[PDB]
RNA sequence: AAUUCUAGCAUCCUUCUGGACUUUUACUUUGAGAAAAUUAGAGUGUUUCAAGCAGGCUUGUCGCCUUGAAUACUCAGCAUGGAAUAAUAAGA
RNA sequence: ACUUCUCCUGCACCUUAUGAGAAACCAAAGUCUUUGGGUUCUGGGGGGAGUAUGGUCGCAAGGCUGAAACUUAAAGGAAUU
């Protein structure tokens, strides 16, 4: 039942039971990995290479024709991110928040839901810290997180 | 959310073996609940079941007779010691006669007529009769 | 040695020089580790299964596969079935040191790595029985576009010897209507 | 009376993605053809962005909710 | 080095080797570091390099401070059963413990075997033996290991 | 032939002549050590019995039964066989 | 926009149960003597009493926590005439 909220939605990619698909699909594992990191290059998160590459392009997957995942083609390359994209996207929703609070004290019910948000950044950077994906000691700070974004 | 697998599925069976149903399938399927249907199997509690190889948990579609009157699950998974496998059976099942109290053990999964012979107790998994 | 590898060794050489040979060229850089003469209940013909070193099996020889089984089965009678040699790991593993183990080594990997390679097709669905009597039968879904070849219907006996010769399993394989 | 293992064709088509014995997308493919250009793109169903041509960007298809618009005439071909 | 008001010096060694150094072997299946043999500390407490038996038990655990000077304190963990409801209970019981200054960075939060001996101090009756390094994320003493 | 346990062969260690390695425990099994009295309990007509630890044969005398008074029971700790289950470790 | 049909996600509704309940009624109050999926909080005849005293929050009004002596054979629930 989400998290949060109450709303119980089931709604999912669902992937093929095929692998290493398809028969009519060719190029290469090589210019895959070129354009992925071309694209990351560019300044384009993980998740909206995959985007890019289904809807213009051919590779329904990239797990399909390659064998790594796209995060793990990044770091192999090392142009990846300096923190991960689902604790960046929360972040920058809580600088954005903390813009409208400080403008209007009165709004009741941004004041809640900028608990929640900041609420799931400590307990989602908790995660990060175990599998050291974070630096040691990292912490947010309301103070220091707008620059941090961007 | 979804602790115990086998306990999921053993409601699911009773409750379409009680509506009366020729086969019904569970999820999210494991090596536990095969080899727990293995030892039914054995005793003549239920007939063939197939495991669909789906690119997940896999489902496990049972075809059944109307035989079993209950099977449950003992969570927690109490340790019991070869002297008290016959004072849970007494408290448990329906009779000294008939019924099946299953059990993990060191050799494998199985029932409590096997654990006696072999030596050898372990943790409570579930019964059934 | 052995006699069966001699025999499967002089036909490749024979590939090589057939006036034109499509394929001769590209085998050079293929070469072949082992046999094992494996018969089918009540076989036709014995069929041959041949295992391939795995860095040629990869880019070097599954590039076209299914010609190179036609050529062999019509040259040498028979049928025969061209497979991977994947070292396995046993569970003591850490003795001797190593301490990953990766799964691609482990044993389901490689007995699903023996079904890919087997049928060569691939696979539609996969499926597994477990009979009263306690005896897993396993089943494997071809696909049914693509019938093409006779042969298949024919070699679809086979593959239940080849799958239980290597792995000591029952597999019973077949089209889905 | 009832057969789990071996369901029929035209109700499991009916269903929900994942409530199916094997789940599998009810997406697809396609290999577009635009007017002007005798070039070819292939293009998925679903297309959350607005896709672009070849060369000298005319316009294959917009996003919508669920399958996307393609532009005017032009034809089509699953994979 | 002498910190010292007292001249700190190594009882094993006598006044005629003064480039000779005393090291112990200690048995009971424990190597002896190399940082003992190799280096010029002296301490009085140390299994390695001074005058103390380790004899009876042996205690692993994870050390909770390094706060106090050649010392530490080894957070023990186990479960309690309680035979009426037929279930366990987490306990804990914090040992004081003495550690000598081979063992180089002893960070919080890393495991520690460590044998008994002759009361050291009021607290302090262990002595350490050998120790393991490790990662521990937040608090140390949230972190439940039986061993 | 069922029911136990165990060696091989499908590519399975070795340093030696039983122990070293297999992440670590819990768990279970067998074993050690743990006072008796009490408690259960073997044997025995205290006249029965609660008890008690005695007795029983026999004109034989260095009396005999090479006389009995068994045995179990007593979380944490020490040790050990083991393929599941559950923690935990890791990620040449 | 409307018609026909399928899919999830909502607030509900009708019908029925060899499912449950003391009954009223209930797709949950079902799958519970054929008793163990995970977990938080609360209750132990009726008064005395949400009172007394102590604590703590409050500008106050009061809130949260919260007894005893003595008292009593019935209080209470759902249906029937």
Known sequence: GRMYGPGKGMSASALPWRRKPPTWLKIKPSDVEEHIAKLAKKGQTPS????????SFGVPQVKSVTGNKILRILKLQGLAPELPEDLYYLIKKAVSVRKHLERNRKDKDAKFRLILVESRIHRLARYYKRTKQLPATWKYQSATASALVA | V???????????????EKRGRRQVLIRPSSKVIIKFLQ???????????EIVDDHRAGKIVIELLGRINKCGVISPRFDIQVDKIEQFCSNLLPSRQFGHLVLTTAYGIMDHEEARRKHTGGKILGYFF | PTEIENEVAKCLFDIETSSQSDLKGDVRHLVISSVKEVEVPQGRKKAFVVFVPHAVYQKTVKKIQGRLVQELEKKLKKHVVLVAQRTMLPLDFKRKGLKVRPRSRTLTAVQDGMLEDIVSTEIVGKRMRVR??????????????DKQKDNIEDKLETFAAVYKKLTNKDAVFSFPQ | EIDLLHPDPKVEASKHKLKR??????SFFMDVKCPGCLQITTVFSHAQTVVLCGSCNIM????????????????FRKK | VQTERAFQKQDGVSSLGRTQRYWKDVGLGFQTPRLAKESKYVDKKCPFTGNVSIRGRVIKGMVI???MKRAVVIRRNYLHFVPKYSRFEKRHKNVTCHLSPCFEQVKEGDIVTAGQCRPLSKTIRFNVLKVEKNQVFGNVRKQFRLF
């Open chain 1, 48 to 55: 909206q290479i995959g985007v890019t590459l289904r809807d």
């Open chain 2, 2 to 16: 979804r602790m115990n697998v086998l306990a999921d599925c053993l409601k699911t069976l009773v409750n379409a």
């Open chain 2, 39 to 49: 030892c039914m199997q054995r005793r003549g509690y239920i007939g063939d079941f």
């Open chain 3, 132 to 145: 009263v009597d306690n005896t897993k039968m396993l089943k494997v879904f071809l696909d049914p576009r």
């Open chain 4, 21 to 26: 014995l094997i789940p599998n997308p009810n």
């Open chain 4, 60 to 75: 294959l298809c917009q996003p919508t909710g669920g399958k996307c618009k393609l532009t005017e005439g032009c034809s």
């Open chain 5, 65 to 67: 401070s390094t706060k």
